[PDB]
Amino acid sequence: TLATKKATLVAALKDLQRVTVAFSGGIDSTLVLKMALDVLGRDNVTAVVANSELFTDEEFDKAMSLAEELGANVQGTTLDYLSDDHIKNNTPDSWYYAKKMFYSRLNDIAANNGSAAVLDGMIARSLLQEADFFKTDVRALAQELGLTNWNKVASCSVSSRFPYGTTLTHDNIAQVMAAEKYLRSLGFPTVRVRFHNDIARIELPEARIGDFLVFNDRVNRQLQSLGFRYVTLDLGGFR
Amino acid sequence: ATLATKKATLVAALKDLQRVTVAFSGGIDSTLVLKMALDVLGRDNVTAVVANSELFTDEEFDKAMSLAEELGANVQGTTLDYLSDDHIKNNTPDSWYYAKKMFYSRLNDIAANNGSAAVLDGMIKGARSLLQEADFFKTDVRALAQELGLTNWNKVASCSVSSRFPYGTTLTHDNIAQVMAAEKYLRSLGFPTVRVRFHNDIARIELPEARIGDFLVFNDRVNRQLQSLGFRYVTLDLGGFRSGRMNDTLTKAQLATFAASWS
Amino acid sequence: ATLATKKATLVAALKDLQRVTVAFSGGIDSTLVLKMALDVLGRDNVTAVVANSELFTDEEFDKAMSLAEELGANVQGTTLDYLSDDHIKNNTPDSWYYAKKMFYSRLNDIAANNGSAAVLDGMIKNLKARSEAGARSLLQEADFFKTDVRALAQELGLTNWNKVASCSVSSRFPYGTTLTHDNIAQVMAAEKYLRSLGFPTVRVRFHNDIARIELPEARIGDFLVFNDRVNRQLQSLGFRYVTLDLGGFR
Amino acid sequence: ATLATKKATLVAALKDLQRVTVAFSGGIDSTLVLKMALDVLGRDNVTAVVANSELFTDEEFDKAMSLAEELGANVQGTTLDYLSDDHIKNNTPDSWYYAKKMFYSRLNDIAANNGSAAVLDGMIKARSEAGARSLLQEADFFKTDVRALAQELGLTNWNKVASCSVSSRFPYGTTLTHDNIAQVMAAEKYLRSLGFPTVRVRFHNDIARIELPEARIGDFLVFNDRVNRQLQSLGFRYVTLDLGGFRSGRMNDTLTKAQLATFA
Amino acid sequence: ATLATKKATLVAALKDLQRVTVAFSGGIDSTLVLKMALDVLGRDNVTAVVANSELFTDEEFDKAMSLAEELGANVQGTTLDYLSDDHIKNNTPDSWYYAKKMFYSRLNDIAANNGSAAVLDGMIKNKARSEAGARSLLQEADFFKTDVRALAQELGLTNWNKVASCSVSSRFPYGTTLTHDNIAQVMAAEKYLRSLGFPTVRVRFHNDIARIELPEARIGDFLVFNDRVNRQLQSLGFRYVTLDLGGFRS
Amino acid sequence: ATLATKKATLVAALKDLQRVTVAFSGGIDSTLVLKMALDVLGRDNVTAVVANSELFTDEEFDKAMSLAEELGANVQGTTLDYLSDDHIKNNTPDSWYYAKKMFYSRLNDIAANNGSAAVLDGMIKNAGARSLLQEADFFKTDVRALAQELGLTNWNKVASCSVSSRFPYGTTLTHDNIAQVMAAEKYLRSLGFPTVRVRFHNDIARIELPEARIGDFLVFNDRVNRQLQSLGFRYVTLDLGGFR
Numbered sequence A: 001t002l003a004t005k006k007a008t009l010v011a012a013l014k015d016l017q018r019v020t021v022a023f024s025g026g027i028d029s030t031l032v033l034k035m036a037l038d039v040l041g042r043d044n045v046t047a048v049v050a051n052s053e054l055f056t057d058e059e060f061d062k063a064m065s066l067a068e069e070l071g072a073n074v075q076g077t078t079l080d081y082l083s084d085d086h087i088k089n090n091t092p093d094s095w096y097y098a099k100k101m102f103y104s105r106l107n108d109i110a111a112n113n114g115s116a117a118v119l120d121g122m123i124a125r126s127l128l129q130e131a132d133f134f135k136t137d138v139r140a141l142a143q144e145l146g147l148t149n150w151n152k153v154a155s156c157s158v159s160s161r162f163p164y165g166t167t168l169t170h171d172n173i174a175q176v177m178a179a180e181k182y183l184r185s186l187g188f189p190t191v192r193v194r195f196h197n198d199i200a201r202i203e204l205p206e207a208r209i210g211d212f213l214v215f216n217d218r219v220n221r222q223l224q225s226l227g228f229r230y231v232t233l234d235l236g237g238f239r
Numbered sequence B: 001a002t003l004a005t006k007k008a009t010l011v012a013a014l015k016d017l018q019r020v021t022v023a024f025s026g027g028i029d030s031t032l033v034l035k036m037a038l039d040v041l042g043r044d045n046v047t048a049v050v051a052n053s054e055l056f057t058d059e060e061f062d063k064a065m066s067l068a069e070e071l072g073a074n075v076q077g078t079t080l081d082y083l084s085d086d087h088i089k090n091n092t093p094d095s096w097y098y099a100k101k102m103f104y105s106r107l108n109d110i111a112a113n114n115g116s117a118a119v120l121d122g123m124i125k126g127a128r129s130l131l132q133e134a135d136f137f138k139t140d141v142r143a144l145a146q147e148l149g150l151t152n153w154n155k156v157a158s159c160s161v162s163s164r165f166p167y168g169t170t171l172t173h174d175n176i177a178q179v180m181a182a183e184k185y186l187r188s189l190g191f192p193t194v195r196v197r198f199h200n201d202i203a204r205i206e207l208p209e210a211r212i213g214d215f216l217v218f219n220d221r222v223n224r225q226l227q228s229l230g231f232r233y234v235t236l237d238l239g240g241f242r243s244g245r246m247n248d249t250l251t252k253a254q255l256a257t258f259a260a261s262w263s
Numbered sequence C: 001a002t003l004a005t006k007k008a009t010l011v012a013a014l015k016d017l018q019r020v021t022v023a024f025s026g027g028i029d030s031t032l033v034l035k036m037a038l039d040v041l042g043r044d045n046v047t048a049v050v051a052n053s054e055l056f057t058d059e060e061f062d063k064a065m066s067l068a069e070e071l072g073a074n075v076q077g078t079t080l081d082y083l084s085d086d087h088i089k090n091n092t093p094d095s096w097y098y099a100k101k102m103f104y105s106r107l108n109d110i111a112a113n114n115g116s117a118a119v120l121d122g123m124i125k126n127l128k129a130r131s132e133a134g135a136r137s138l139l140q141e142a143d144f145f146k147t148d149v150r151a152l153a154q155e156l157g158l159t160n161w162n163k164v165a166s167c168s169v170s171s172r173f174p175y176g177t178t179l180t181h182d183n184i185a186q187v188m189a190a191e192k193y194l195r196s197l198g199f200p201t202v203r204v205r206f207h208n209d210i211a212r213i214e215l216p217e218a219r220i221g222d223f224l225v226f227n228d229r230v231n232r233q234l235q236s237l238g239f240r241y242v243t244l245d246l247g248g249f250r
Numbered sequence D: 001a002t003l004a005t006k007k008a009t010l011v012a013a014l015k016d017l018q019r020v021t022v023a024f025s026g027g028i029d030s031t032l033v034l035k036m037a038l039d040v041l042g043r044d045n046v047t048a049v050v051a052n053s054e055l056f057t058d059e060e061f062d063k064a065m066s067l068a069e070e071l072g073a074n075v076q077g078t079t080l081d082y083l084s085d086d087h088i089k090n091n092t093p094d095s096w097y098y099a100k101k102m103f104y105s106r107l108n109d110i111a112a113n114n115g116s117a118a119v120l121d122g123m124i125k126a127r128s129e130a131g132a133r134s135l136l137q138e139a140d141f142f143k144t145d146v147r148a149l150a151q152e153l154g155l156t157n158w159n160k161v162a163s164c165s166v167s168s169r170f171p172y173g174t175t176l177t178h179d180n181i182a183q184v185m186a187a188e189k190y191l192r193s194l195g196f197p198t199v200r201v202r203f204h205n206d207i208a209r210i211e212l213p214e215a216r217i218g219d220f221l222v223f224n225d226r227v228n229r230q231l232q233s234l235g236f237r238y239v240t241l242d243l244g245g246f247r248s249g250r251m252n253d254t255l256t257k258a259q260l261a262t263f264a
Numbered sequence E: 001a002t003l004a005t006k007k008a009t010l011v012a013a014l015k016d017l018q019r020v021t022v023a024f025s026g027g028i029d030s031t032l033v034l035k036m037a038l039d040v041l042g043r044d045n046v047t048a049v050v051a052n053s054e055l056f057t058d059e060e061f062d063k064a065m066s067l068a069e070e071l072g073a074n075v076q077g078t079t080l081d082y083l084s085d086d087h088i089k090n091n092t093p094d095s096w097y098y099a100k101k102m103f104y105s106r107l108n109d110i111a112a113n114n115g116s117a118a119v120l121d122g123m124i125k126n127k128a129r130s131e132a133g134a135r136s137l138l139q140e141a142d143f144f145k146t147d148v149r150a151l152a153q154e155l156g157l158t159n160w161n162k163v164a165s166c167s168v169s170s171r172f173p174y175g176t177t178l179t180h181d182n183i184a185q186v187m188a189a190e191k192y193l194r195s196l197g198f199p200t201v202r203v204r205f206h207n208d209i210a211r212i213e214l215p216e217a218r219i220g221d222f223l224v225f226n227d228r229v230n231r232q233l234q235s236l237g238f239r240y241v242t243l244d245l246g247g248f249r250s
Numbered sequence F: 001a002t003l004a005t006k007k008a009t010l011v012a013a014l015k016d017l018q019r020v021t022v023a024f025s026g027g028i029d030s031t032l033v034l035k036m037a038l039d040v041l042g043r044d045n046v047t048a049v050v051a052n053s054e055l056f057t058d059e060e061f062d063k064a065m066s067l068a069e070e071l072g073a074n075v076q077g078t079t080l081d082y083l084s085d086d087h088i089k090n091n092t093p094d095s096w097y098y099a100k101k102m103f104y105s106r107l108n109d110i111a112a113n114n115g116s117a118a119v120l121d122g123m124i125k126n127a128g129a130r131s132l133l134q135e136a137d138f139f140k141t142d143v144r145a146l147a148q149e150l151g152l153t154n155w156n157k158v159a160s161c162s163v164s165s166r167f168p169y170g171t172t173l174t175h176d177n178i179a180q181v182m183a184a185e186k187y188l189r190s191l192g193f194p195t196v197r198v199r200f201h202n203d204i205a206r207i208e209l210p211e212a213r214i215g216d217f218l219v220f221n222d223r224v225n226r227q228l229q230s231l232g233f234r235y236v237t238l239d240l241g242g243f244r
């Protein structure tokens, strides 16, 4: 039952005392943070929102507001992922070196503010995952707590827009980020502007490509003014 | 009158029954009944029963079983053999009634053995439909479900696969699986509301009209996929899913007459 | 041989016949036969005949009638009752021979009654019913292939002819399905309505209570604005379900 | 009767007249009259007149002048100011008639000054007021007889594109101006330039209401934004697409085509 | 500083007022106010008022009345005749203000007649209200949008009208006279279009023209309804039914 | 000037030349020229030459050979190797110049060897070759009018362009990369899109379509994607700007 799973989560937090919660602003880390606040109190919880080049300022700013809005003391940290050459040169194992810096930075903060653990929200401790929370358990328990506000856009590292072996730069990331942001603003929340030097190759879910046709000309000019020479749509669609 | 009066009628009927067996489909209506029964009578006085059958997907049974447990109910699966009844097997126009009889015979048998005073279902405006007795309309169901914190249920209206077949066509495991696989494939492309109507060698696909503009990119893949499942011709119904429900005043009048001409 | 030798062969055969009846479909081949008959024998000595029937559209008929007039021929329409022949009515693979037999029988009656020496059709080189009725395919006898037809038509200044290939409506019904006046009309009215929307190439395949519409796949995107009207229009023609074949044309 | 008799009637009427002024639009009908007039009376006895005006495109006028020259006729262009008549300028339901009145008046003036015996048009009361002669109609030509004789005469060049007075883009009672006429003409030309040869930009003050064949509306969506901006820069505040399309109800099922005709 | 400090300011202002009349729209803000008013003053000391009018739909009124009941408040509906004010009727750029003037006038009449010490609305930190002395307690306690959601969550509030309504006058050009008939026809058109799956829509009124505003991303799927939408809005009184090429809020 | 006047100028020039070799593409312009030459000089005094090459399609070549015979000309096929020239093969902005040199050079050899007085092509208004339509001031509208008057109706209506334009400047043309682009465009034309470019970007194909056609193309996305991948592209894409 959900009530049995919440007790597992309630009990696990009680044993840990002071915690540092890795907070993404999504529904999962939102549930963890609110449950931590409810059982341990605001003086014993630290919300950490990681800012970095591989994810959007909109997600960072949204998460920072939501943690404060949920009543947690919130702290920002900036990771410089591109200082790592594996990330900078986008190898197939970049993902690994990024996570190392992420968890290292939160492990440093937790040891430095007296936390007993770093917590995350995977379906470090994933107490939701240890308590056998499914996606549906997350929804019911959050509604029960009166939670309705969280970032519903699933973010993924911008390195996925670049081929392996391509050097990431500050300029490349900003160009892809602005292009994807413009496209979401047209009504397409799921999109990728895959970077191929002078070509942008846009990925949309195949079910959305018919609706996109009204925007062809505007997207072409906009992504050209961001620096692409050719703006194209992948016939295979998203993934 | 207000929702609170409708809720109070519901609480009162539940307490009077003491022990209930709740037929739980996973839709929003039976969820509210199940939630209310647990809350007023307690978990030891409620048995959630989910009927699994050949006419419905294992996906709906599994989803329903998990939701009943997640709400804190003891839930037991039971399997009905609808195709053992000749009216159902040959899909007569009253097949629905013998299916419902076989359904309710099974839940009354379960109720007698677990000491329940009644079988509850989620019918709204031998079994008891407390939502209907308390004058719940569809909007009342949604308001109390929101008030109660209920957010998980199957939001796609489930329907017996017999409706995909003409009256008089014999249902088989082969033709049922053929219809379900076609519907599962179409859902897997992003069309959660769809019907693959069976007409022997013709597949007639029904979509919400608002989605048919999106579908064209899949024409060739759906054609070839449904052919390998056994159809010779794969077609899209021009009237779409629930023809006439979206139409202007004159053409809903016209399509309703067309729909009555084949009564 | 040269186009000129083939043209000369055709001219001499026409001269020998003096008076002719041309089976005129409006297509390029009988257009060439008809124009040549006119040029060699004169308008007074040529009767152009367009057959109207239940298995083909009135639009194809009226178009041929106007085209023959435009070439300067006296044209007469005749009606065939193909469904009175049970071999046609029962839609077997050999129905088309009995259709052509009835067709050539009517043209021989017309030719006999106006004193023509032959019935002419536009068969070209690369048919039993034609020879058994004694009709002449002078383009085929003169070794005209399709490019010879185009070459002589260009030389004659012919530029207007019916470019739409006609097909008997019986292809809308599966083999063994009985043709009736009502089910033929139902398919014809349906296809005529769909063409009127801007789809000149279309098929309404008959499957009793199901209409299965075939469109060129490149046109299906345009069709969506018409879904509801086509659905209701074809139900009012008697179908229970109106469907679009996901496979497209043929 | 027979085609040969209809041609003879036409030839004789031409001979009885001896000198004519032929109203030449460039269409097939006035092309046939002009060719027959030349053949019977000779170029010195035929004057081709092409009327230019604000209610039609410059392309069609220039096209007609060249076509008459191609037939070997002495041709005169004349310009009409239809907007000087208040019925035309204020677009009343009878505006068309006063347009023809001004048209036939100007051609009669030309014919009287060059010594023609009649004005000829290619029609198959403004003519009975002016004295205009429709010799094809007096000889009972139908449309196919016009086609037969044009082919028989070896005519192959004429304007096959249907022209329509731009006054039809304006509601009755709306004042035509040089500006709003040019505004409508510029809009339709832009839409034709995108690949839409059958189109109307109906004028509704600050609104443009575009009529397209419905089979084209799906492809048109790729141009929405460019059309919106282009027609706004021509002076419309709102650029809209008629949901009923070009010639509403002509492509509707029987029930809803009679309900669309009832509403109108 | 903190939500708690802001909540405290609001609670004290509520206590100081003892008895209040709450202007309840059904939205999140006035939902927060009404819940705070009920929790602090008790159900006998708060009157929830939902304004019904021609410039808004019966559906939003029915939702707000029902929502106020769900919160456990005594709620009373009142009807405003916005069209009685000629500034509103002739839709000048100042129509909005004369509407709010009439609104706050009616709420003061109710509050004075039930013995309330103030009318409360749900204005937050982010006009004709101050020209009536109505109190925006969330605004005085410096509630921003995040504070409203933060406190609503803490109070267990999850149910409110999430669809922001908009006065139907925005469908009419400045200088256009609003009538009972043209308001109702614009409202029925938008309702019919919402019923097709377009919750964000505008039917702009231009006498005999309806100019429909849709999000551009929806227009590809909308084509399947063109003819039905065309005939439906003509049956409502439009002579022409059109789609704005610029989309929603062009 | 009237069409009859320009045609008369054309007739006189042809008579003046007596014997000509006509560079025949199958398009409307060279079709008009070829027909006028045949009509004025007779089949014995006209040689139609159709150039086959690696930069233009075998289909357009076969169509012209058929069209020349149908027009009543003795027609000769000749094969050019544009790629044997390094300027062409290395695809610079000067490639066109060497291509035209090689083209007119081969036609001059043919014309000199059969005794023609000139090579004729179909240039219209707006080298060692005569463009009689341009000298007689034919515009596109005059070409069509005279073509109709002559009863000409059959010609290749899709405007041809050297395949080298599918590759960026500085990209070396190969037999393989050309064939890959030629197969991709042929597949696309076979679906009903006679105007298309498959622009080559190594592992990316960038398809250009007339924008008016892009709405209908969507029913083909997956098949074009799969087909152009088996031809060797990794990503198959559509240019949002459309054709040209």
Ligand SMILES: Nc1ncnc2c1ncn2[C@@H]1O[C@H](COP(=O)(O)OP(=O)(O)OP(=O)(O)O)[C@@H](O)[C@H]1O
Pocket (backbone or CB within 6 Å): A022, A023, A024, A025, A026, A027, A028, A029, A030, A048, A049, A050, A051, A119, A120, A121, A122, A123, A154, A155
């Ligand atoms: N900027 C970030 N800052 C802090 N924590 C993060 C951040 N991004 C990801 N995480 C942490 O890592 C966990 C898993 O990350 P991820 O976003 O990939 O999965 P998720 O399903 O979206 O979880 P969530 O719903 O919490 O966002 C989050 O629950 C969260 O604890």
Ligand SMILES: Nc1ncnc2c1ncn2[C@@H]1O[C@H](COP(=O)(O)OP(=O)(O)OP(=O)(O)O)[C@@H](O)[C@H]1O
Pocket (backbone or CB within 6 Å): B023, B024, B025, B026, B027, B028, B029, B030, B031, B049, B050, B051, B052, B120, B121, B122, B123, B157, B158
């Ligand atoms: N497989 C099933 N297993 C158990 N109970 C079922 C099942 N299907 C239907 N029911 C029960 O019988 C009632 C009838 O459900 P039905 O599908 O006919 O309408 P419904 O609106 O979908 O109901 P609901 O919202 O409760 O799912 C359900 O409310 C539920 O109580």
Ligand SMILES: Nc1ncnc2c1ncn2[C@@H]1O[C@H](COP(=O)(O)OP(=O)(O)OP(=O)(O)O)[C@@H](O)[C@H]1O
Pocket (backbone or CB within 6 Å): C022, C023, C024, C025, C026, C027, C028, C029, C030, C031, C049, C050, C051, C052, C120, C121, C122, C123
């Ligand atoms: N409705 C018809 N009316 C008169 N003759 C017809 C008709 N249909 C076919 N024919 C005659 O029979 C001949 C064969 O017609 P068929 O359609 O099988 O071949 P075709 O290639 O289309 O020839 P064509 O170019 O003349 O149309 C025609 O050339 C014509 O002479």
Ligand SMILES: Nc1ncnc2c1ncn2[C@@H]1O[C@H](COP(=O)(O)OP(=O)(O)OP(=O)(O)O)[C@@H](O)[C@H]1O
Pocket (backbone or CB within 6 Å): D022, D023, D024, D025, D026, D027, D028, D029, D030, D031, D049, D050, D051, D052, D120, D121, D122, D123
């Ligand atoms: N600009 C114009 N200039 C001179 N005459 C004109 C002009 N427009 C129309 N006409 C003349 O008035 C007659 C009627 O023209 P109308 O457009 O009404 O019919 P039509 O069927 O198109 O005739 P046509 O084939 O000659 O174009 C024409 O036949 C022609 O004689």
Ligand SMILES: Nc1ncnc2c1ncn2[C@@H]1O[C@H](COP(=O)(O)OP(=O)(O)OP(=O)(O)O)[C@@H](O)[C@H]1O
Pocket (backbone or CB within 6 Å): E022, E023, E024, E025, E026, E027, E028, E029, E030, E031, E049, E050, E051, E052, E120, E121, E122, E123, E164
């Ligand atoms: N029909 C109405 N009846 C009663 N009060 C209303 C009504 N409409 C608006 N209001 C009141 O006026 C205040 C502001 O109105 P408005 O809708 O413009 O802003 P809002 O930000 O949407 O507020 P809310 O979230 O409460 O709906 C509302 O918070 C509410 O107190």
Ligand SMILES: Nc1ncnc2c1ncn2[C@@H]1O[C@H](COP(=O)(O)OP(=O)(O)OP(=O)(O)O)[C@@H](O)[C@H]1O
Pocket (backbone or CB within 6 Å): F023, F024, F025, F026, F027, F028, F029, F030, F031, F049, F050, F051, F052, F056, F120, F121, F122, F123, F159, F160
């Ligand atoms: N494969 C080719 N073979 C023979 N001649 C050619 C060929 N391609 C071009 N030409 C000749 O050179 C001239 C210029 O051709 P080009 O394609 O560049 O322009 P064009 O407008 O298409 O002319 P056309 O209508 O005749 O094809 C042609 O008219 C023709 O005379």
Ligand SMILES: [Mg+2]
Pocket (backbone or CB within 6 Å): A024, A025, A026, A027, A153, A154, A155
């Ligand atoms: Mg997340």
Ligand SMILES: [Mg+2]
Pocket (backbone or CB within 6 Å): B025, B026, B027, B028, B157, B158
């Ligand atoms: Mg259900």
Ligand SMILES: [Mg+2]
Pocket (backbone or CB within 6 Å): C025, C027, C166
């Ligand atoms: Mg034929």
Ligand SMILES: [Mg+2]
Pocket (backbone or CB within 6 Å): D025, D027, D028, D163
């Ligand atoms: Mg005309």
Ligand SMILES: [Mg+2]
Pocket (backbone or CB within 6 Å): E025, E026, E027, E028, E161, E163, E164, E165
């Ligand atoms: Mg609101």
Ligand SMILES: [Mg+2]
Pocket (backbone or CB within 6 Å): F025, F026, F027, F159, F160
């Ligand atoms: Mg060419």
